[PDB]
């Protein structure tokens, strides 16, 4: 980075360069210089000039060149994990279709209704306003296929969780949601009851249409994709991101699909669950999922009501997930780095046993 | 109620026994997944 100072008839520019000690926000894996204890560095150079205007333009152009370089490096890093997919093979007959559907994430800032088509090796979303806003999803790349009915919500949903992330517009996403809001403005006690009945009929019709279409996607996959429906009665409230949301268990996953960002936790990928802030006098605990892939960041579900603790413990046991409980929130970002550094030494010592508070294994005998 | 809480708590002893079997199962699973030869071959992420 650099600075510019005006002093009498002269303009000063200080240019600062990358050196250890005055390091940038880059991680330890990629340095802007080659590693070297014996390497000396040019930390800063200060120049002066009588021409103030040009020297200000030069400083602007250096700053712009840095912004363009950083933007190109971010764009490269966002593209490195985008696996090139096969091309969608169009169905040679009349394709099965679902009309008046919204897509999330939207490929364009403008929310537009589209049509979803079933093809031989995947699904295609196609906007009527622009042919270029097509979203193609191969069956081979779908990991999980969810159907969420409109019963207590104002929208019906068809959610595709992906194995490899897709570029939709400018956003990389693992999740592609297809939905249609039933929310309709409808206005003595007979008319209101007729509107409420018409809304219930519309909800039931949309749920039947979307369910049938989701079954037709599962059938078209030749048994590669199972259709999952959430168990609402087993749902609990929590905060995985920034809002309180109803987390819903399915057959194979813990999901939240209503609000963005979406939560999709596959139960088989969990190594251990940790219940934080389980202590007398707290109203709420936190739940932490650790994955079998230690490179994957841990998932937090915060502010779960303590009334649901024994239910969550039972549910984790019924799913064969080990759990531990603790009074304190752990620094998982340090723990997972230690475990990544030597996974073998971690299991040699005892592995996940350290999460069980303190292993005193002795009678407290506090009473005298 | 006392015989139901005894029954519910014996189901909770089975819950704990399952949880203990799960912790012992994962310990052994991890010990198998990671061998001392992989630890010797440490792909140190020297800054590239």
């Amino acid at each position: 980075n650099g600075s510019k100072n005006e002093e009498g008839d002269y303009m000063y520019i200080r240019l600062n360069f990358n050196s250890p000690g005055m390091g940038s926000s880059v991680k330890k894996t990629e340095l802007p210089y080659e590693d070297g204890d014996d390497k000396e560095f040019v930390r800063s150079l200060t120049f002066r000039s009588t021409n103030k205007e040009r020297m200000s333009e030069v400083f602007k152009a250096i700053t712009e060149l840095k912004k363009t370089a950083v933007k190109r490096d971010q764009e490269r890093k966002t593209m490195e994990d985008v696996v090139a997919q096969a091309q969608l093979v169009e169905f040679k007959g009349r394709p099965k279709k679902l009309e008046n559907v919204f897509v999330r994430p939207a490929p364009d800032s403008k929310r537009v209704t589209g049509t979803l088509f079933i093809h031989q090796n995947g699904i295609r979303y196609q906007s009527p306003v622009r042919s270029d806003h097509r979203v193609d999803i191969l069956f081979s790349n779908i990991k999980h296929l969810f159907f969420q009915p409109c019963k207590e919500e104002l929208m019906v949903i068809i959610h595709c969780h992906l194995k490899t992330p897709l570029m939709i517009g400018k956003k990389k996403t693992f999740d592609v949601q297809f939905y249609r809001e039933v929310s309709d403005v409808t206005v003595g006690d007979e008319d209101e009851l007729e509107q409420e009945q018409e809304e219930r009929r519309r909800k039931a019709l949309l749920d039947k249409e979307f369910r049938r279409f989701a079954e037709e996607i599962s059938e078209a996959s030749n048994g590669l994709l199972d259709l999952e429906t959430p168990f609402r009665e087993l749902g609990f409230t929590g905060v995985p991101f920034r809002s309180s949301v109803l987390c819903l268990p399915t057959r194979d996953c813990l999901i939240q699909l209503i609000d963005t960002p979406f939560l999709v936790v596959t139960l088989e990928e969990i190594e251990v669950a940790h219940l934080e802030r389980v202590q007398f006098g707290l109203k709420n605990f936190d739940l932490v999922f650790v994955f079998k892939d230690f490179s994957k960041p841990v998932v937090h579900i915060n502010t779960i009501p303590i009334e649901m603790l024994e239910f969550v413990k039972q549910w984790l046991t019924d799913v064969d997930i080990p759990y531990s409980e603790g009074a304190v929130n752990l620094n998982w970002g340090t723990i997972m780095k230690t475990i990544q550094a030597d996974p073998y030494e971690f299991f040699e010592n005892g592995g996940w046993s350290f999460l069980g508070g303190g292993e005193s294994d002795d009678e407290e005998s506090e009473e005298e | 109620r006392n015989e139901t809480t005894n029954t519910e708590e014996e189901k909770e002893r089975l819950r704990k026994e399952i949880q203990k079997q799960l912790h012992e199962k994962i310990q052994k699973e991890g010990l198998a997944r990671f061998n001392k030869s992989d630890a010797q071959d440490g792909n140190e992420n020297h800054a590239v």
Binding site: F280, D361, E363, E364, E366, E367 | -
Partner: peptide, 20 residues
Amino acid sequence: ELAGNAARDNKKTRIIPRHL
């Protein structure tokens, strides 16, 4: 009952205010 359960989940023989 539940205090004994919680003290047994922490491998402790004595019930303390924490378990209550």
